Amino acid sequence: SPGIWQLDCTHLEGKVILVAVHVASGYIEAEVIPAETGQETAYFLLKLAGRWPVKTVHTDNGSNFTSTTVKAACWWAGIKQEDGIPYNPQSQGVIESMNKELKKIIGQVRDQAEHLKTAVQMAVFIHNHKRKGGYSAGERIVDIIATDIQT
Amino acid sequence: SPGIWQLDCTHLEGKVILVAVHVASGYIEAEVIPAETGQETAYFLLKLAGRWPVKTVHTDNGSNFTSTTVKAACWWAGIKQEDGIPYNPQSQGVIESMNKELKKIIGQVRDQAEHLKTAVQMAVFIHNHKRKGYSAGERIVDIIATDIQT
Ligand SMILES: O=C(O)c1cccc2ccoc12
Ligand SMILES: O=C(O)c1cccc2ccoc12
């Protein structure tokens, strides 16, 4: 479904990496923050929704589901906030594996980057460009949404 | 072409807004930074090229064109760096008008945001969703989707 994203928060080097995954394509955006607060999560979702047509977000935990700053940004940006409960459980494993994959890439580039934030963005780039066509996630998200626009 | 972006740096509230415009669609990504440096520009290009299929960037000035750090990020991300000289001169007035438009949006949301960086991101959202009949966000997806199919 073209508008559905999942939030995912993972830890590395005593810092937090906030990830949004476009569930249908596997495409991601990510940022490093010093910790997951509502204010950070709200800003991150605002950035995401100005860049892709975000209709539904599965939030990553109940604090962010509850957070009034996150609810304000979802209201502002037109995003329906949902809980992120894996009523389908293969769903949990998909995210865990991506966190493992991302950290692996971060490790592979870590020495090319002075700051963790550069390595995370190199990781976003390699993730989004990897051919799986085969098509990449970046190709899949564009195809999904462009098919959707023809409606 | 689907892969061509232009960098654009504008100032407001004694801060700098770095903008990348996807030239064919008008779609933008922007960030606030304390000053335009090679390091900031390099990191911004790295983020953009992980998000969209960036093939050529028209750099905004000669310092960023020259910058070793920007050249390094362009190398890493597979981006051809080009100067941004207005070869067709209508190019130029297009950017100035966009900067004026953005700043207008920023003023209209400014009071809903405590920090300039929130207002800038609200402005990117309004800019990219505005219908002109398709929005810039729809145009960039259609352009690149058409591209992928060949
Ligand atoms: O390869 C593509 O067409 C593509 C489309 C949209 C986003 C990204 C990020 C890396 O590649 C892409
Ligand atoms: O509306 C769309 O399909 C769309 C596609 C790609 C990006 C953006 C940003 C807001 O809207 C979009």
UniProtKB/Swiss-Prot annotation, chain B:
* Domain annotation Integrase catalytic: ranges: 1-144
Question: Where is Mg(2+) 3 bound in this sequence?
Answer: 8, 60, 96
Q: Tell where it localizes.
A: Virion; Host nucleus; Host cytoplasm
User: What domain of life?
Assistant: Viruses
Q: What does this protein do?
A: Catalyzes viral DNA integration into the host chromosome, by performing a series of DNA cutting and joining reactions. This enzyme activity takes place after virion entry into a cell and reverse transcription of the RNA genome in dsDNA. The first step in the integration process is 3' processing. This step requires a complex comprising the viral genome, matrix protein, Vpr and integrase. This complex is called the pre-integration complex (PIC). The integrase protein removes 2 nucleotides from each 3' end of the viral DNA, leaving recessed CA OH's at the 3' ends.
Q: How does it assemble?
A: Homotetramer; may further associate as a homohexadecamer. Part of the pre-integration complex (PIC) which is composed of viral genome, matrix protein, Vpr and integrase. Interacts with human SMARCB1/INI1 and human PSIP1/LEDGF isoform 1. Interacts with human KPNA3; this interaction might play a role in nuclear import of the pre-integration complex. Interacts with human NUP153; this interaction might play a role in nuclear import of the pre-integration complex.
Q: What is known of its domains?
A: The core domain contains the D-x(n)-D-x(35)-E motif, named for the phylogenetically conserved glutamic acid and aspartic acid residues and the invariant 35 amino acid spacing between the second and third acidic residues. Each acidic residue of the D,D(35)E motif is independently essential for the 3'-processing and strand transfer activities of purified integrase protein.
Q: What is this protein called?
A: Integrase
Gene from which the chain derives: gag-pol
